[PDB]
Ligand binder design. Structure first.
Ligand code: A1A42
Length: 167
């Protein structure tokens, strides 16, 4: 039993809700919140911009030190950093950005990072400003993640379309 509330159950391990991931994280304080990161951990907009803003830019400060030490992530890769005031940890995961021409096949590799954590609060990878089809992203999530994932979909219309179109 965990403290996630109001989710619809899609499969044995995947759950979904129309919610703002920032507000969900502040309420639940999950062990792991997933960020929709880019390889430079430049948290400018979308999910990343919103999560970073909620940390008063502390996420960006920590991320800049990480990059200065380690260099950029790989598309499809991840790193674990602090969750600041939102969660114990933040798993920064880089899905492919279609608006940059990146290979959508890397979306499965991106979701594989979730399997290293027993329970996660997460957005749909490569959705939103990353340009991929969110229905496809949900299909990849369900077919790749085996650990318990609680998906927050900000847009009510998309959520309804995601639920209503789920096979
Ligand atoms: C992954 C993408 C595309 C699908 C969106 C959806 O789930 O409807 C969620 N996404 C966001 O980038 C996004 C999420 C939360 C916030 C935000 C942007 O900005 C303002 C804010 O306070 N929160």
């Amino acid at each position: 039993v965990n403290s996630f509330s109001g989710y619809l159950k899609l499969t044995d391990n995947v759950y979904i809700k129309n919610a703002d991931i920032v507000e969900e994280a502040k309420k639940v304080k999950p062990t792991v919140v997933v960020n929709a990161a880019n390889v430079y951990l430049k948290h400018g907009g979308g999910v990343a911009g919103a999560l970073n803003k909620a940390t008063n830019n502390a996420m960006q400060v920590e991320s800049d030190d990480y990059i200065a030490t380690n260099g950029p992530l790989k598309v499809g890769g991840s790193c674990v950093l602090s969750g600041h005031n939102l969660a114990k940890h933040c798993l920064h995961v880089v899905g492919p950005n279609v608006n940059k021409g990146e290979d959508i096949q890397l979306l499965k590799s991106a979701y594989e990072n979730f399997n290293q954590h027993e329970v996660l609060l997460a957005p749909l990878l490569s959705a939103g400003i990353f340009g991929a089809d969110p229905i496809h992203s949900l299909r990849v999530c369900v077919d790749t993640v085996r650990t318990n994932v609680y998906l927050a979909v900000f847009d009510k219309n998309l959520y309804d379309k995601l639920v209503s179109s789920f096979l």
